Amino acid sequence: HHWGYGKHNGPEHWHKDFPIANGERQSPVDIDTKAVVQDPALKPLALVYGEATSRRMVNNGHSFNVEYDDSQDKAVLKDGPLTGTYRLVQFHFHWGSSDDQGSEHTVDRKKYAAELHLVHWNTKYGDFGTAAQQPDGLAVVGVFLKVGDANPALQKVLDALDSIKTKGKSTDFPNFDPGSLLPNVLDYWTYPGSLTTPPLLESVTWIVLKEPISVSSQQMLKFRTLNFNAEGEPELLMLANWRPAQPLKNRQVRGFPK
Ligand SMILES: CCCCCCCCO[C@@H]1O[C@H](CO)[C@@H](O)[C@H](O)[C@H]1O
Ligand code: NA
Ligand code: NA
Ligand SMILES: [Zn+2]
Protein backbone atom coordinates (compact mmCIF):
# COMPACT_ATOMS: atom_id res chain seq x y z
CA HIS A 1 0.00 0.00 0.00
CA HIS A 2 1.31 3.41 -1.08
CA TRP A 3 1.60 5.86 1.79
CA GLY A 4 3.34 9.13 2.31
CA TYR A 5 3.05 12.55 3.84
CA GLY A 6 0.90 14.27 1.15
CA LYS A 7 -2.75 15.39 1.15
CA HIS A 8 -4.28 12.05 0.10
CA ASN A 9 -1.91 9.37 1.54
CA GLY A 10 -0.59 11.13 4.65
CA PRO A 11 -0.71 10.36 8.40
CA GLU A 12 -4.42 11.34 8.55
CA HIS A 13 -5.24 8.40 6.24
CA TRP A 14 -2.78 5.65 7.19
CA HIS A 15 -5.45 4.07 9.33
CA LYS A 16 -7.36 3.05 6.18
CA ASP A 17 -4.66 0.54 5.23
CA PHE A 18 -2.88 0.13 8.56
CA PRO A 19 -5.61 0.10 11.22
CA ILE A 20 -3.07 -0.20 14.04
CA ALA A 21 -2.47 3.52 13.38
CA ASN A 22 -5.23 4.02 15.98
CA GLY A 23 -3.85 1.44 18.35
CA GLU A 24 -3.06 1.79 22.02
CA ARG A 25 0.73 2.28 21.83
CA GLN A 26 1.34 4.49 18.80
CA SER A 27 4.29 6.85 18.33
CA PRO A 28 5.36 9.53 18.40
CA VAL A 29 4.09 11.23 21.54
CA ASP A 30 4.45 14.53 23.30
CA ILE A 31 6.56 14.12 26.39
CA ASP A 32 4.92 16.11 29.17
CA THR A 33 7.93 16.70 31.42
CA LYS A 34 5.78 17.22 34.55
CA ALA A 35 4.25 13.77 34.05
CA VAL A 36 7.60 11.98 33.56
CA VAL A 37 8.18 9.42 36.34
CA GLN A 38 11.40 8.25 37.85
CA ASP A 39 12.26 4.51 38.02
CA PRO A 40 15.19 3.07 40.06
CA ALA A 41 15.23 0.02 37.76
CA LEU A 42 16.37 2.20 34.89
CA LYS A 43 20.06 2.14 34.00
CA PRO A 44 22.42 4.35 32.12
CA LEU A 45 22.26 3.61 28.39
CA ALA A 46 25.02 1.55 26.86
CA LEU A 47 25.43 2.41 23.15
CA VAL A 48 28.27 0.18 22.04
CA TYR A 49 28.90 1.63 18.60
CA GLY A 50 32.70 1.63 18.24
CA GLU A 51 32.70 -1.35 15.88
CA ALA A 52 29.50 -0.50 14.00
CA THR A 53 30.19 -0.93 10.28
CA SER A 54 28.16 1.33 7.96
CA ARG A 55 27.48 -0.03 4.47
CA ARG A 56 25.36 2.23 2.37
CA MET A 57 22.91 5.10 2.34
CA VAL A 58 19.56 4.68 0.57
CA ASN A 59 16.68 6.93 -0.37
CA ASN A 60 13.77 4.65 0.55
CA GLY A 61 11.08 7.04 -0.74
CA HIS A 62 9.95 8.23 2.70
CA SER A 63 13.28 9.26 4.14
CA PHE A 64 16.93 8.10 3.77
CA ASN A 65 18.71 5.58 5.79
CA VAL A 66 22.22 4.54 6.63
CA GLU A 67 22.51 0.74 6.75
CA TYR A 68 24.75 -1.09 9.23
CA ASP A 69 25.97 -4.67 9.06
CA ASP A 70 23.74 -6.35 11.63
CA SER A 71 25.08 -9.88 10.78
CA GLN A 72 27.80 -9.39 13.43
CA ASP A 73 27.41 -9.06 17.17
CA LYS A 74 29.38 -5.86 17.64
CA ALA A 75 27.28 -2.68 17.42
CA VAL A 76 24.73 -3.08 20.16
CA LEU A 77 22.40 -1.21 22.41
CA LYS A 78 21.86 -2.46 25.95
CA ASP A 79 21.04 -1.48 29.50
CA GLY A 80 19.01 1.74 29.77
CA PRO A 81 15.45 0.37 30.13
CA LEU A 82 16.26 -2.80 28.21
CA THR A 83 16.62 -6.47 29.05
CA GLY A 84 19.06 -8.12 26.68
CA THR A 85 20.93 -6.85 23.67
CA TYR A 86 19.76 -5.08 20.54
CA ARG A 87 21.69 -4.82 17.24
CA LEU A 88 21.95 -1.60 15.31
CA VAL A 89 20.47 -2.09 11.82
CA GLN A 90 20.04 1.43 10.45
CA PHE A 91 19.49 5.10 11.21
CA HIS A 92 17.33 7.64 9.45
CA PHE A 93 15.87 11.08 10.08
CA HIS A 94 12.61 13.00 10.06
CA TRP A 95 12.42 16.72 9.39
CA GLY A 96 10.07 19.54 8.47
CA SER A 97 9.58 22.23 5.90
CA SER A 98 11.00 25.01 8.11
CA ASP A 99 13.57 25.00 10.89
CA ASP A 100 11.13 25.30 13.74
CA GLN A 101 9.28 22.08 12.99
CA GLY A 102 10.23 18.58 12.02
CA SER A 103 10.76 16.44 15.06
CA GLU A 104 8.29 13.59 15.61
CA HIS A 105 8.48 13.53 19.43
CA THR A 106 7.86 16.88 21.16
CA VAL A 107 8.77 18.04 24.68
CA ASP A 108 5.96 20.05 26.33
CA ARG A 109 4.81 20.60 22.75
CA LYS A 110 8.11 22.05 21.62
CA LYS A 111 9.32 20.86 18.24
CA TYR A 112 12.92 20.62 17.05
CA ALA A 113 14.21 20.96 13.47
CA ALA A 114 14.68 17.24 12.95
CA GLU A 115 14.93 13.91 14.72
CA LEU A 116 17.36 11.08 14.25
CA HIS A 117 16.15 7.45 14.76
CA LEU A 118 18.70 4.76 15.47
CA VAL A 119 16.87 1.47 14.93
CA HIS A 120 17.79 -1.72 16.77
CA TRP A 121 16.44 -5.31 16.96
CA ASN A 122 16.53 -7.74 19.89
CA THR A 123 19.13 -10.45 19.23
CA LYS A 124 16.99 -13.11 20.78
CA TYR A 125 14.71 -12.99 17.69
CA GLY A 126 17.55 -13.62 15.21
CA ASP A 127 16.75 -10.96 12.60
CA PHE A 128 15.07 -7.56 12.14
CA GLY A 129 11.84 -8.86 10.54
CA THR A 130 11.22 -11.45 13.22
CA ALA A 131 12.03 -9.05 15.99
CA ALA A 132 9.65 -6.42 14.52
CA GLN A 133 6.69 -8.67 15.25
CA GLN A 134 7.25 -8.85 19.05
CA PRO A 135 6.34 -6.23 21.66
CA ASP A 136 9.91 -6.38 23.00
CA GLY A 137 11.48 -6.80 19.59
CA LEU A 138 12.72 -3.31 18.67
CA ALA A 139 14.42 -0.41 20.35
CA VAL A 140 14.66 3.01 18.76
CA VAL A 141 16.93 5.77 20.06
CA GLY A 142 15.61 9.16 19.17
CA VAL A 143 17.89 12.22 19.03
CA PHE A 144 16.72 15.75 18.52
CA LEU A 145 18.49 18.09 16.11
CA LYS A 146 18.42 21.68 17.38
CA VAL A 147 19.25 24.53 15.04
CA GLY A 148 22.49 26.28 15.93
CA ASP A 149 26.12 25.52 15.04
CA ALA A 150 27.06 23.45 12.03
CA ASN A 151 27.54 19.77 12.93
CA PRO A 152 30.71 18.30 11.29
CA ALA A 153 29.71 14.67 11.88
CA LEU A 154 26.28 15.31 10.36
CA GLN A 155 28.01 16.96 7.40
CA LYS A 156 29.47 13.61 6.36
CA VAL A 157 25.90 12.29 5.96
CA LEU A 158 24.62 15.41 4.18
CA ASP A 159 27.51 15.38 1.75
CA ALA A 160 26.29 12.05 0.45
CA LEU A 161 22.74 13.18 -0.28
CA ASP A 162 23.59 14.47 -3.76
CA SER A 163 24.09 10.80 -4.63
CA ILE A 164 20.65 9.59 -3.51
CA LYS A 165 18.23 12.32 -4.72
CA THR A 166 15.34 10.07 -5.69
CA LYS A 167 13.62 6.98 -4.40
CA GLY A 168 15.65 3.83 -4.70
CA LYS A 169 18.98 5.52 -5.20
CA SER A 170 21.85 4.27 -3.01
CA THR A 171 25.50 5.09 -2.46
CA ASP A 172 28.42 3.37 -0.70
CA PHE A 173 28.77 4.91 2.78
CA PRO A 174 31.66 3.27 4.74
CA ASN A 175 33.24 3.92 8.10
CA PHE A 176 30.59 6.23 9.53
CA ASP A 177 30.51 6.19 13.41
CA PRO A 178 26.91 6.46 14.52
CA GLY A 179 28.07 7.56 17.96
CA SER A 180 29.29 10.76 16.32
CA LEU A 181 25.55 11.71 16.15
CA LEU A 182 24.93 11.30 19.91
CA PRO A 183 25.08 13.96 22.58
CA ASN A 184 27.66 13.75 25.41
CA VAL A 185 24.95 13.38 27.99
CA LEU A 186 22.76 10.26 27.56
CA ASP A 187 19.88 11.17 29.89
CA TYR A 188 16.66 9.81 28.35
CA TRP A 189 12.94 9.39 28.35
CA THR A 190 11.49 5.96 27.64
CA TYR A 191 8.05 4.58 26.82
CA PRO A 192 6.54 1.67 24.97
CA GLY A 193 5.45 2.53 21.47
CA SER A 194 5.59 1.89 17.77
CA LEU A 195 7.27 2.50 14.44
CA THR A 196 6.24 6.03 13.30
CA THR A 197 5.81 4.83 9.71
CA PRO A 198 3.68 2.05 8.25
CA PRO A 199 3.45 -0.70 9.10
CA LEU A 200 3.28 1.10 12.50
CA LEU A 201 4.07 -2.05 14.48
CA GLU A 202 3.72 -1.77 18.24
CA SER A 203 7.09 -3.41 18.90
CA VAL A 204 9.30 -0.48 19.88
CA THR A 205 10.80 0.48 23.21
CA TRP A 206 11.45 4.17 22.67
CA ILE A 207 14.52 5.80 24.13
CA VAL A 208 14.34 9.57 23.48
CA LEU A 209 17.52 11.45 24.50
CA LYS A 210 16.96 14.64 26.47
CA GLU A 211 19.96 16.50 25.06
CA PRO A 212 19.87 17.45 21.33
CA ILE A 213 22.72 17.57 18.89
CA SER A 214 23.16 20.65 16.79
CA VAL A 215 22.55 21.32 13.11
CA SER A 216 22.94 24.59 11.12
CA SER A 217 20.07 26.17 9.20
CA GLN A 218 22.23 25.80 6.06
CA GLN A 219 22.58 22.03 6.79
CA MET A 220 18.78 21.73 7.16
CA LEU A 221 18.39 22.95 3.55
CA LYS A 222 20.20 19.81 2.37
CA PHE A 223 17.55 17.50 3.82
CA ARG A 224 14.77 19.25 1.91
CA THR A 225 16.28 18.77 -1.57
CA LEU A 226 15.63 15.00 -1.49
CA ASN A 227 12.73 13.66 -3.48
CA PHE A 228 9.98 11.29 -2.38
CA ASN A 229 9.49 10.22 -6.04
CA ALA A 230 11.59 7.92 -8.20
CA GLU A 231 13.40 9.27 -11.31
CA GLY A 232 10.91 9.90 -14.04
CA GLU A 233 7.99 10.49 -11.72
CA PRO A 234 6.76 13.98 -10.93
CA GLU A 235 9.01 15.76 -8.49
CA LEU A 236 7.74 15.70 -4.83
CA LEU A 237 10.42 17.16 -2.68
CA MET A 238 10.95 15.72 0.81
CA LEU A 239 9.98 18.89 2.54
CA ALA A 240 8.43 17.12 5.61
CA ASN A 241 8.23 13.46 6.70
CA TRP A 242 7.08 13.60 10.30
CA ARG A 243 4.04 12.06 11.98
CA PRO A 244 2.18 14.20 14.51
CA ALA A 245 2.04 13.25 18.18
CA GLN A 246 -0.31 10.39 18.98
CA PRO A 247 -2.44 9.95 22.16
CA LEU A 248 -0.35 8.67 25.10
CA LYS A 249 -3.48 6.79 26.26
CA ASN A 250 -2.63 4.65 29.33
CA ARG A 251 1.14 4.83 29.04
CA GLN A 252 3.68 6.60 31.17
CA VAL A 253 6.95 8.12 30.12
CA ARG A 254 9.84 7.20 32.41
CA GLY A 255 12.95 9.31 32.84
CA PHE A 256 16.60 8.59 33.60
CA PRO A 257 18.16 9.77 35.82
CA LYS A 258 14.82 11.37 36.57
C1 LIG B 1 2.32 -6.77 8.06
C2 LIG B 1 3.05 -7.30 9.28
C3 LIG B 1 4.48 -7.81 9.07
C4 LIG B 1 5.44 -6.72 8.55
C5 LIG B 1 6.91 -6.92 8.94
C6 LIG B 1 7.79 -7.57 7.87
C7 LIG B 1 8.65 -8.63 8.53
C8 LIG B 1 9.35 -9.54 7.55
O1 LIG B 1 9.99 -10.58 8.31
C9 LIG B 1 10.94 -11.29 7.57
O2 LIG B 1 10.15 -12.24 6.89
C10 LIG B 1 10.90 -13.07 5.98
C11 LIG B 1 9.95 -13.85 5.08
O3 LIG B 1 8.92 -14.41 5.86
C12 LIG B 1 11.77 -13.99 6.81
O4 LIG B 1 12.63 -14.68 5.92
C13 LIG B 1 12.67 -13.14 7.73
O5 LIG B 1 13.44 -13.97 8.63
C14 LIG B 1 11.91 -12.04 8.49
O6 LIG B 1 12.95 -11.17 8.93
NA1 NA C 1 21.52 -5.97 3.60
NA1 NA D 1 23.78 2.69 -5.88
ZN1 LIG E 1 11.82 7.17 12.22
Residue numbers in the entry: 3 to 260
The paper states:
A well-studied carbonic anhydrase II was selected for rational design as it has efficient CO2 hydration activity and could be heterologously expressed in Escherichia coli. Herein, we describe for the first time the successful redesign of a mesohalophile enzyme to an extremely halotolerant orthologue, that is, one that is active at 3 M NaCl and above, by altering 18 surface residues. In contrast to suggestions that large differences in accessible solvent area, non-polar surface area or absence of large hydrophobic amino acids are the important features that allow halophilic enzymes to function optimally in high-salt environments, we have found that increasing the number and distribution of surface acidic groups alone is sufficient to impart this characteristic.
Crystal structures of WT and engineered enzymes were obtained to confirm the presence of changed residues, that active site residue positioning was unaffected and also to compare the overall structural similarity of the designed proteins with that of WT. The structures of the four engineered enzymes superposed almost perfectly with the WT enzyme (maximum root mean square deviation (RMSD)=0.42 Å for M4) with no significant differences apparent in their secondary structures.
